[PDB]
Amino acid sequence: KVVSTDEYVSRTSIYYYAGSSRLLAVGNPYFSIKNPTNAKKLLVPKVSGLQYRVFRVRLPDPNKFGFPDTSFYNPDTQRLVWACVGLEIGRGQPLGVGVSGHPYLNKFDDTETSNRYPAQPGSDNRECLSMDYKQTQLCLIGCKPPTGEHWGKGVATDCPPLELFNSIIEDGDMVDTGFGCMDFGTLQANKSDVPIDICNSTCKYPDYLKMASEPYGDSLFFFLRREQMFVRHFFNRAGKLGEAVPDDLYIKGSGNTAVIQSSAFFPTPSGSIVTSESQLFNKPYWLQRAQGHNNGICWGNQLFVTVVDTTRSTNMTLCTEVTKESTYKNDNFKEYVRHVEEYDLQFVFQLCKITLTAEIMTYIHTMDSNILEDWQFEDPLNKYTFWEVNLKEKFSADLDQFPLGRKFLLQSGL
Amino acid sequence: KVVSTDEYVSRTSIYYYAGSSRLLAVGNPYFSIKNPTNAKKLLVPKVSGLQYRVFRVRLPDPNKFGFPDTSFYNPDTQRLVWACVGLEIGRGQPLGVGVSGHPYLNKFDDTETSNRYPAQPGSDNRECLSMDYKQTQLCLIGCKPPTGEHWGKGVASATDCPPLELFNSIIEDGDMVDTGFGCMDFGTLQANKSDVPIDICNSTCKYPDYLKMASEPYGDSLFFFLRREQMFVRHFFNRAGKLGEAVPDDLYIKGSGNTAVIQSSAFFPTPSGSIVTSESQLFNKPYWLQRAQGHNNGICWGNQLFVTVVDTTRSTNMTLCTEVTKESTYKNDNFKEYVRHVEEYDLQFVFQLCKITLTAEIMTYIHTMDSNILEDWQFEDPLNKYTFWEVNLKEKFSADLDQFPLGRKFLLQSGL
Amino acid sequence: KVVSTDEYVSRTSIYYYAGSSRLLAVGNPYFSIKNPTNAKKLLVPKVSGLQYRVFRVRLPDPNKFGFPDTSFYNPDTQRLVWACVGLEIGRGQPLGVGVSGHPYLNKFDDTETSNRYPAQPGSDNRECLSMDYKQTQLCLIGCKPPTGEHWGKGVASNNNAAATDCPPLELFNSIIEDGDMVDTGFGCMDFGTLQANKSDVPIDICNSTCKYPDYLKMASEPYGDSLFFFLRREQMFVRHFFNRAGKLGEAVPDDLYIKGSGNTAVIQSSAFFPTPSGSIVTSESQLFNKPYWLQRAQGHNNGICWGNQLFVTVVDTTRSTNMTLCTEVTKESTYKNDNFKEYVRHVEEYDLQFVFQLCKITLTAEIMTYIHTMDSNILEDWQFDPLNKYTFWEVNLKEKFSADLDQFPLGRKFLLQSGL
Amino acid sequence: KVVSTDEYVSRTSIYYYAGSSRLLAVGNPYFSIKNPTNAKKLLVPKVSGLQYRVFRVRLPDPNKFGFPDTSFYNPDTQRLVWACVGLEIGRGQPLGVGVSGHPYLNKFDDTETSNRYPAQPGSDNRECLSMDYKQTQLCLIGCKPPTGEHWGKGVAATDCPPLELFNSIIEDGDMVDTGFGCMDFGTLQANKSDVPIDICNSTCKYPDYLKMASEPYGDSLFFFLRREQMFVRHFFNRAGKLGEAVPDDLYIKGSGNTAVIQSSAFFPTPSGSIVTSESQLFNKPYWLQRAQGHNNGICWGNQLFVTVVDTTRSTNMTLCTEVTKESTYKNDNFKEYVRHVEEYDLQFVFQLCKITLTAEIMTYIHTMDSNILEDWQFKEDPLNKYTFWEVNLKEKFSADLDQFPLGRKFLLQSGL
């Protein structure tokens, strides 16, 4: 039913390079700061190494592109499309690791070595703790935005019902950090069971299984992923235990041990060490043969690059002096936290042409009716937030004038 | 006497793909919650990353299957069977590590650096502690369910120590894997219910009996297997209670005064599975079953196959928290805390159709191997007493291999 | 526009070896000490395993070079230039790790396992702590000095009302000079201007700027003179979790928590910061004391040392051991702390080894135009200094070139590797 | 001009095996013990896994060796010399790690997580601490003893000792660097308490690889291997006056309890981390086929130097004697000792070589080392002032290569 694009998309020998140049984001890693005197504007964005970067890369429409020689296709019977054959995700800034925390984290006791009876249950025992998150590197590439999975509140023990949800991963969405891919805002009502940079967020994980089994293969031309973590500490929660331990799993205590302590345990993660050798980025990927049926065809003259890279999640400390005095006083200083991200996206594109026979027109229409409509032979994604990368005026045919271009010519023997 | 299936099972060039689609299990990682007014009515099942997943995969009987053209075999003289030539065990959810504990764990002292005399006295010094378990990945494939080993209470036959006996049993869906405390029946061998965390303290932890399964004459249990285990000692504790076997007098000089009353030498460690990484993953990659080591080269007798999996690398337990009363300031009594765990699978197979010419010698051989094969071919089920995760593929077979992920991989890998 | 040097630079079979011999630096890893008079003299330089070493290597002008027979060179139509084809960065001293600290580090609480309410109030809760930094190995090679990136104080629009008074951040490019500090785990920033309390990082960077190589910019340079070749190995993990004292400049928004009361009414600082750790150093992961053959550069300059000079940039924290020195002010039969003075010193040992290949260029009209657009000084200096404002470790090889390759370690390696 | 020995040293097809047999050293790892009255005699030597082992291996002079048939060379016009073509450094004892410490280590505060103000004053705050040192494996081979580098006191706002880098011959028993650098601790640390006692009155040396590699003739390093590792285990600061105060532009002054600045004379303790079999450099053969330097294994002077550091067997054994036997335990009834042992077994394969004493070759050799021709008869040895572990193989040479382990390995490797 579905066939490879190799069977109805003809390749030319025409290649183009396009680069975004340096992309920077600067903000607060834990939360954005809205403008107090203009509520519709953000004063400081939320910029964190635990966010997805979802780039919507806009390509020049090859059917309107000022090629010097346009005799390679017949506009009466054919249309043009770009194919992505090479990519490098440039990453700036040094390798490093940031931390995240909560001034009122719901940690009660340390349950690793010593937690004797009786409990000391007050009504507000939250503590100001921080941690370093699970480490994640990944890149997804396709002509359709990626699909994530996360757990949320479903439809109806008083435990919230769990439902697995699919959604489009948007630029700025949070990746899972060690506490799972879930809607923490709705499933953790106390706002204190995870650090503040996810406690009112949804952490999403790429739905690799769903995307890979898509018939046309528009979501994943190519992907890399590297995750790691271990358990750094063991805590338990304050609050009522919603599901008591059944009586067949213990002999009751008495006296000092009569009032059972909370078995609502939770670990803290740690991503451990970051190293250059395990970097996925700053090297080229050649999209020669995709596993799916879309062999890199950028339908709609666009392409989506999704990236998570926690290996440069350093958060910088900033400190201002409000009063200059000869001796040190805390009240004379203000402390800030800032995080930055540096990207440089480089592509090699191959021009393709499609002869629109009756059979091919039916196939394309069944696959995506917008393709023929846009070819002349409202955009549904504008409700989503992406990092827009406009390459319409960035295409160059002089491949050997750019780093990735030289690599392509050398690799391909051209 | 036993020969390879390659000698009497004819391979065709007909291949079919079958996939389970998304399989989800959601529950409490530490215990099930029973309906108070029923016994087999579960309100919340026990779903944990430390459980065996034993999938009983039902295949369509090829002798009754709607093939478009069956002219490739003579039903008067031959019977059909599926062979598994490819499989990928898909795993969803992010990598992570969960913890387990006991609100009354029988830990007395930390015995790593400082445990001075004299012994502190008590009758209930249990503590509310947790740990992260040994890390295990494994994958078994066969047309017969897998066999486990575990230590249990033997026969009663200067020590009241329970006798130990090594038991074999079928590993069922939901059985607990060993966690760092060994493969034993904790319910019967640890009578106090407090020496290990609550998710195994009343369970039997089983380890696959690889040696027995591997030495089976016909080799139906293990077409293929992968395994990756690791742990280290994170902490050193000792037990409270009477020491059942005192240290002999030739191993120490007796103390006096504050050291006159000997402290408990019933030590026990806590395990740690250490780090989880993508590179060490066994799953989300294809396995091509070309040449089995045993005599059964992937033949799915009885139109079924058993896929057994342990994967602790996605054992994260999600914290859930409900608000009973909304108030402007934080109060512990206004919230309830829950724990939930989920597992996501996607089993993908490529099967090769095979035919067997039922000569006199071959029927004799097959009857000796398993008399049910010829009876079901027409030329009750003892496994109904066991619990498996049923995966019904009777309506999931497709000849359009290139329309599915594993199907494309198979066509590419085989040059077809 | 830009073409590979392979298209207009002719390679000869003439090879030369040159070595710097042992290069030593000795000083204080945390700060320099000035002569009280003379003020602009250094008494003890600042020498640290966390510094960049930027060697400006001077080569003999091959167009004036005493070759045994120069009849192969026609000065009427061609000029000579050296190409670097082999390099080894020798490192002496044992592998090891140093630590850095601050007697008044702005650490308030340990936020890893226990930090209950209420907070302890004070005005000066600084502590005397130390740490081991992120581990970095790198070496860059080109005929132009390298470019670093670092964050500094930018410009703040004043028409824009500031609800946050946080300093604006700007990414700055600069030439990396010998003695500049590498990033240590707290990022590449100007700590002197962006941390006004002088207490948020150890003293060896608290009044310094830590720089990171701008690899992306250097790689995208049209001619590729900065990076013939580079190697890099970074690693770190989080060793401890602390928070800062001082007023929190950006309060946590009210939608991320339920307010406290009583002991928890005054929120504690969420201005967290980790301490880094470079972890283990091993021989197996060393980048140095091994040869590199510069056969084919990724950029268009395939190792041509224009201007008869070469830049070697090195970071190597794997030998950052700081030696403890102790003098006895008064000899007594029993120990007393006041009888001794404690000092710290650090040393660095280098040995740079090169193999150069002689090249000649026939100066046609087309090539002269190309080179002039590339750099007009090349044709001027050939008869056919802007870098003096920067600080480099000068390595003069003008009189160290030898044709007897097999008389030297790297020369023997080259002859064997190339089959000569 | 220097040329390879390949150009003037003729190889024969004559090979010999030689082995040292078991070499044992037994002593105290921290210090030597003199005879209790007589003092120039040692009762217990200092034997530690942190020492260099420098073996001076004496070979039989081949020009005086009882060969059965000497028609392979002309003794009037030629001289004989041995070339080393194979070597294995045998190591006995199990892998393990020792620790070193000081009963009066100059450690003031733990500066890793908590070191608040004010500093408490004292005059003697030294502590009884220990640590495990940096891990080092290495082996050097040449016909000349190896050269080490270390920092010592040189000549000539700061009273800090001037530093000079010194070269010296590494002798048997010299200390390797341990994590505190290669320096003369006796002269540069006057308090004798800034490092553990096994180096506080010693010089820790590091091989001057750069100097030896650049020697024209290449006599020091036929071949070498090295593997070092460490991390920082703890962070401390020193007591005593700070000799160089922190400049005023690097901090804002304190007040009250923070008025008296604390010592920023930090120092780490090292740790060599784990030792494993897989990273072993020893107990495997090295074939010296073609050296990088110009001396291709020629053992001038009928000797060769094998230098080893191996901290991967640095276990220190605990010994304990009973002075009074009593029914209850008392500390004063026992004496505690520490002992360390090292087990070596050096195995060599040598190839016999001949040199024709032409006018040109005698001139070349005379310029290289005037002693070579003198010793050939065509005298105080200068190395007698240095200490080496003497290994005499004069009576250990055998032509029956296949009767010994390394000999068999050589025959197999070389196709003979």
Numbering used by the authors:
A (entry chain B): 20 to 175, 183 to 403, 437 to 473
B (entry chain A): 20 to 176, 182 to 403, 437 to 473
C (entry chain E): 20 to 403, 438 to 473
D (entry chain D): 20 to 175, 182 to 403, 436 to 473
From the publication, what sentences describe this entry?
HPVs are non-enveloped, double-stranded DNA viruses comprising multiple copies of the major (L1) and minor (L2) capsid proteins. The native T = 7 HPV virion can be mimicked by an empty icosahedral shell, called a virus-like particle (VLP) which consists of 72 L1-only pentamers. High-level neutralizing antibodies elicited by L1 VLPs can block HPV infection; however, protection against HPV infection is type-restricted, and there tends to be little cross-reactivity among HPV types. Each L1 monomer folds into a canonical, eight-stranded β-barrel (BIDG-CHEF), with the strands joined via flexible surface loops (BC, DE, EF, FG, HI).
We solved the crystal structures of pentamers of the lead double and triple chimeric candidates H58-33BC and H58-33BC-52HI to resolutions of 2.5Å and 3.5Å, respectively. Further pairwise comparisons of the surface contours of wild types and mutants illustrated that the most distinct bumpy protrusions between parental and targeting types were located on the side-chains of K53H33, N57H33, K59H33 and K60H33 for HPV58 vs. HPV33 (bottom left), and K380H52, S383H52 and E388H52 for HPV58 vs. HPV52 (bottom left). By loop swapping with a few aa mutations on HPV58 L1—i.e., S80N, N82T, N84A and V87L for BC loop, T375K, G378S and D383E for HI loop —the resurfaced structural contours of the BC and HI loops of the chimera nearly recapitulate those of the HPV33 BC loop (middle and right) and HPV52 HI loop (right), respectively. These subtle structural resurfacing changes in the engineered regions might provide structural evidence for the cross-protective immunity of the chimeric proteins. H33-58HI and H58-33BC mutants showed comparable cross-protection potency as that conferred by bivalent HPV33 and HPV58 VLPs against both HPV33 and HPV58. To verify that the residues exchanged on the surface loops of HPV58 introduce a similar functional surface area as that of the corresponding heterologous type, we recruited mAb 4E5—a conformational and type-specific neutralizing antibody of HPV33, the binding of which could be redirected to H58-33BC and H52-33BC-52HI —and determined cryoEM structures of the 4E5 Fab in complex with HPV33 WT VLPs (HPV33:4E5) and both chimeric VLPs (H58-33BC:4E5 and H58-33BC-52HI:4E5). Similar binding occupancies and binding angles (60° for H58-33BC:4E5 and 60° for H58-33BC-52HI:4E5) were observed for 4E5 Fabs bound to L1 monomers of both H58-33BC:4E5 and H58-33BC-52HI:4E5 complexes (middle and right, middle and right). Further analysis of the mapped epitopes suggests that the 4E5 Fab binding orientation and footprints covering both the BC loop and the EF loop are similar for all three VLPs-Fab complexes.
